[PDB]
Symmetry: D2
Subunit: 504 residues, 4 copies
């Protein structure tokens, strides 16, 4: 009657859908990590504390804007808000910090707003003299090489793809275009060139410094913008270097080349972001769902984290409740298989950042119950390579056992996080309580569906079995406290050993 | 490398997802009906013609606003725009008219309010407790919801009765009945339409908790369902809506009855010429869920971009239709299925997957025969050739049915009249780019199935 | 409550198994073709008539024995017996004639000069094998002549040699130029003209010998429907048989017999070149370890089903019935399991050729095949066949698969198919409907060859062609309805499916 | 490449068939238990030793024949043969003893006389002709055969090869043949009023308890109450003896579910069954019963005529080879030999052939679908031991382990693992000699008997038994150092089930 267990028992997907029940309450635990972009509306310590309480797991810093000093301060406030809960390690929630690079962006100059009208002429110039004199006649932008990569007849998008132009003529140092989709044009707006092979560096001089700064600031992960190919990833990896070797690189797929070359990018990366914002300008908007499902499926297949991003609850920037399309989008990203879901303007600058976060937590939890685990697990089994790795055997063994005895959690003791990632990849219904003494492991674990990281602060006990018992008992106290399970329930414990344990 | 045929051949749903390909172009035909709400932005004859050319199949009239004379005029304009293409029967596209009732609404006017009373106003955006907890700018005669409260208004009020009557007068093809809570609500509407309106399809709108709980009996009584997500998502927690949506679409598919996904599908396109990524995904997922039709409200009623909204639903539906995992869907429909006409339809659908036909052509008077084929959800479009104009319009309710209105005289020799109608379908399909000479299509003559080369 | 329909509805194979019901009776129709080897026990017109009535569909002539004159007389008797029923076209059953070649056999000589004579071999004793034709008909306890002149260059000391269906085992202890001295590893009775296997050896005999060529030409002259080619090892072997049949025998079906390891290894190219396959378990289970035969069998049947080419399961299926009126439990199981595997036909050898209970054996295959055909898990089989079928531009394939799908939906009493060459009906059979396929043809050879395919019940229309097409179609369909009613496949009012050659119609029985 | 692993990966059953490869060799371990009927041909200590070496796991004594004195000697000989291997516990193979009851048989008197197709015969109950049966008069021991018979009723003699049509009965030979003494007689479609447990069966069952037999195969079980009667005779002293119900008539098939519930296991007794019901229907009953036993997690034996021709020949027919393979493919826990080992000329060859075929067949199982289905059809519970067993089987598929090592006292824990039908052998280490013998009834369980004394230190005790298992596996070629195996530690004295699964490299 709870957790859509009646639907879970259906023998066909169609019957599974038919049994979905709005009156069947979800379990307390929410498995899908929530990533929040931080900015004006959410940067204060006090607001940050509330965002943690509402469900924020990862703080995203968008380096397309802001100075190092501005971001260092954000990072400082995140940690302050986060450590304000550190006194009770049973209820302390780790919070990750993610650095999202600028990457090979193209931006217009400074206009004030001008109205671009359908059919009108607009000249694109590179002449720095017009750098701050952008108007409805002449538009400067910062991609000096633009004329060498675009052709006559090709389209240029400006401002989240809302304004569109067609290249009509190529001048010596300029482009002559005609407005197709008009609208009001502001300053320093994003420009996209679908069909063009932009030859900006995968990692610019600015990107290099931003990455280095990330290392200095001990960030947990990097969201690398406009990744086109494995070599782009390698450059990011080399820049993070030895000091940042444990920082996870999440490649953002935002253009056609990234999709085409997805497999090599995935192999090189620690995870993927479906960056629907740019992607849905670079390719036709009606095709984005295809790329999203393809990437989520392939990440699920490979056991690597995948993030669904951009415009998930967009209207909530201005309103306290989302649209029905938005409710559906979050649910479907989760049903698709997304490890995490993301908020951008909704939390960075919107008027209801707390409600946005809470709505993502609510929808995700409902959606997680509605997953058809019977089929998903069967298929993950079949598609999983038969190998000799014993930790891999234990992981699937534990997940199988968790479905059988309908356990309240799988408790995993992990140093690097790997052991727990191996369990997550099989997508158990039961929450995975990953107990670790490594603070970075705890933060980064949020990247994986189902992992609820807890940070053990007790010293290592001399006797191994006592040290194990200490950590498992910790996990038990967390589960009871958070209402995941209670005395007398049954949980699976992984330490290579799997034990099925009654909760005290 | 087209129609997601590589993903179509996957052995598992996961591998199906893994193979979805942005570079695999869809076919030209679009199976999912598009229902547009008409209003100031789309009322003119000139704009209506563009909306037909853009993909509109059903004109929805919201009787929550406007007078009979107003609606009569809209109806008149729809028919003028529609008939403007009649000169070429090969190119004429039927357009249906839907009457959507006010039903048990509450506007800023509920009598025993204080006898049943959280209170919501304006798409549940403004919230109230018996203090303004949420809020913002309040407007005129906005809609109110009392979640959890048993509002005792009549399922069919006096206004409703007169509106339904007006429906019969106006020869509308279908009624979308609001706030249907139970089988008995459906029976009241049916009685009003009475004998004169017995052929008018009744679509029950599920917009409250009781509608969901009593879904099965409501579906048994109705001709179809609308997942009325607007009110539904105020009446129950917004985060539960997708559960209701998928349950209803699932159960409608299982029953063989039309289901409409409605409300806020492309909402932002009221003010912008492009949708958000959430809206792109919503339309696509509604089609993947199994929705027969998708709907536009404000987007076509009142927005700045009516035509763009219609074109975008058209583009997305078409992409999503190819991304359906037909292998699993068809097998599950076959297994879950409980008559020679039924055997012939399932056989045609099976054939169509086998030879990857350009179409299944069905000759049908009442539409039943084409409905029976649509219920097995073929990939190939269903070109339904009928001489019955009402049949031609109502057929839009079913996924995959592309109705065509034959106006040729009835030939004396049966086989000749069949051949004339089939060749009419061939001509329509060639003209619309569905297939070309040499291609193969399946033909159901009305119990006969032919596998036939396009002449 | 009939035809295992409760089991048919199960959602899993495991549950399909659990629902199999001994009290759920099968339909009348039996889909699996029964092939009977003719010999002393079954050569008379009287017995042949009864065998036909008991369910024989194909008469197999074993050219490993007998003269051309002998076989001509057999064929003559088969046709006399077959045509004795011709007077009522509605009840006439076409009966096919199959020529099974000798091929590259090794044969022993005559024991004490008699075809019927035996001697005992005792375990541990010694036995000399000779090629000296002086001992051709003087085989016995101590001297065994065989006809493979080059045997000494293919075998060695330690080499194992099997005689008579692998029952007698010998090991070579000493060579010679004209002989081998062997030790009997397993004794028993040693008859005359028995088959010899050298499972370790590389026999140098040709796939198609000059005797085989004569026999094949004779087959063409005699108008046989099909050839069962022995010891086929590769595609080129098939092509040689095909070439020998020539233009005149171009329509004769070639069935390749797989009886050695190489035939299994190169199975795919053999199948591609062949009209169909025989799982020749006799020789095969001597040439490879007996415990592996079931693997080869299931692999071959599976791949034949996948290819849509007929496959025959053969040899020792009801062996004990050569001497006894009822089969063993293993034999009942074997027949049932061959049909569950997907075998188009089953075969009887000694059971019908020389045994004391030929009619009972034919009857038992009939009874078992029918029970097992209902026990098939069509739900999964049809789903898999389809899933594994190429999307193609072929309209006849689309029609065939549509007919089969419909026949499951309405559980029809039959799929009626008008066919000239038989191909159209073959295309239906490849999708394995539960309902019998009544193939109406005017072509007598088509009618006979149709027995190769599971579920095809061929009927031969003798009526003159009608000038009006729709009238000619209606005549043939009504013929089919008449046969169906008379055989009890269905009755007036039942719904059946009709393919006319591309149209599918779903009509009621008149 | 090996163990049909390529076919193992196929996405459909059909493609699974297409990939079966005569050149893909199986592993060493053979999971299907082999039950051998012991008689004149296999009764000596010398021959019994070879029987064990050839693959015999269970010795069946048919109490339809022979005196207690005869059977005690056979049992003594089995035990002498079996203990002759006990010096090296690592290579010792437990051997179970099964007592198969006479039950409600009907037989004829003493006399051979050739019977002729078309001839009258006198079925007489007159005990004067008890030892004077002949071509004209035939006496049988079923005294009330008249209340149950009727005109036109049929009667079968000698494995139903001779058939007859109907305080005495005059009949006609509907089917002839030579007639011996004391042959089995069947009355299909008639209700035989004999006791499920007769005076003799009772004494045989008590003798069985006294002789410490591991299991009883109870003949002609028609209903749940028959099973209870058998359980009652075995009583408190025989409470741990497994009752296998033999399903040999229509009633037993009909009332199968209640019989299965009351029983420790099932025998598909195809001999009598194929006389009681039409022979062409037997395979339906077999697959039904095997399927339902697999579903219930209870042992099922396929019996009778599996390698029949090997009574006289050193090699089986092709239908016999097929029958064995298919019984295994069906899911039979055990397969059986009767005349082939009791009296045939090639008992050792018959044992070996069952061993070879079962091993080839075990590899050819489509585990992918079988495991999926067993799971989906398996009631979820809170039972931690259930969770650990299924978890271990899943793990064993994932990492193609060499074995699943299970520590068990009464065998139950090992049975739970076996019900999920792993490909890997389940090495069941026990200190209980009976558990080690009875474990043979379960597909995939390879029982090893630990002779070591219990250690005080539990961890030391576990290591001891586990290492024993490692040594067994290595010595029998199941795995080698560096391989990976799954270990289930089971019951801890005074604490209870550990509910622990370890994944371990072979030392």
């Amino acid at each position: 009657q709870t957790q859509q267990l009646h639907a879970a028992m259906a023998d066909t997907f169609l019957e599974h859908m038919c049994r979905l029940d709005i009156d069947s309450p979800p379990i307390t635990a929410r498995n899908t990590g929530i990533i929040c972009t931080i900015g004006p509306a959410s940067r204060s310590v006090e607001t940050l504390k509330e965002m943690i309480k509402s469900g924020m797991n990862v703080a995203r810093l968008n380096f397309s804007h802001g100075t190092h000093e501005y971001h260092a301060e954000t990072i400082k406030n995140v940690r302050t808000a986060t450590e304000s809960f550190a006194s009770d390690p049973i209820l302390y929630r780790p919070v990750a910090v993610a650095l999202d690079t600028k990457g090979p962006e193209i931006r217009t100059g400074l206009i004030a707003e001008v109205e671009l009208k359908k059919g009108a002429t607009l000249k694109i110039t590179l002449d720095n003299a017009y750098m701050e004199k952008c108007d409805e006649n002449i538009l400067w932008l910062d991609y000096k090489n633009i004329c060498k990569v675009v052709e006559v007849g090709s389209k240029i998008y400006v401002d989240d793809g809302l304004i569109s132009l067609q290249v009509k003529q190529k001048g010596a140092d300029f482009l002559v275009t005609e407005v197709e989709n008009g609208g009001s044009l502001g300053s320093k707006k994003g420009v996209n060139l679908p069909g063009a092979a932009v030859d900006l560096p995968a990692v610019s001089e600015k990107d290099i410094q931003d990455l280095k700064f990330g290392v200095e600031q001990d960030v947990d992960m990097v969201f690398a913008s406009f990744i086109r190919k494995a070599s782009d990833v390698h450059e990011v990896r080399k820049v993070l270097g030895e000091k940042g070797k444990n920082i996870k690189i999440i490649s953002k797929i935002e253009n056609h080349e990234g999709v085409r070359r997805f497999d090599e990018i995935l192999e090189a990366s620690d995870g993927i972001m479906v960056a629907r914002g740019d992607l849905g300008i670079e390719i036709p908007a009606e095709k984005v769902f295809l790329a999203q499902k393809m990437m989520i499926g392939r990440c699920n297949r490979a056991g690597k984290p995948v993030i669904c991003a951009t415009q998930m609850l967009e209207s909530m920037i201005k309103k306290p409740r989302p649209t029905r399309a938005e409710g559906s989008d979050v649910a479907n990203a989760v049903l698709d298989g997304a490890d995490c879901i993301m908020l951008s303007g909704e939390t960075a600058k919107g008027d209801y950042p707390l409600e946005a976060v809470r709505m993502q937590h609510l929808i995700a939890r409902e959606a997680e119950a509605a997953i058809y685990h019977l089929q998903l697990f069967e298929e993950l089994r079949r598609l999983a390579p038969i190998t000799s790795d014993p930790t891999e055997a234990t992981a699937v063994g534990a997940v199988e056992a968790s479905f059988k005895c309908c356990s309240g959690a799988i408790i995993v003791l992990t140093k690097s996080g790997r052991y727990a990632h191996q369990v997550a990849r099989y997508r158990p219904r039961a929450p995975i309580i990953a107990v670790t003494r490594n603070p970075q492991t705890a933060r980064q674990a949020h990247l994986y569906r189902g992992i609820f990281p807890v940070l053990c602060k007790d010293p290592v006990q001399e006797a191994w079995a006592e040290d194990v018992d200490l950590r498992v008992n910790f996990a038990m106290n967390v589960g009871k406290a958070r209402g995941f399970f209670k005395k007398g329930d049954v949980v699976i414990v992984l330490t290579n050993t799997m034990r099925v344990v009654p909760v005290p």
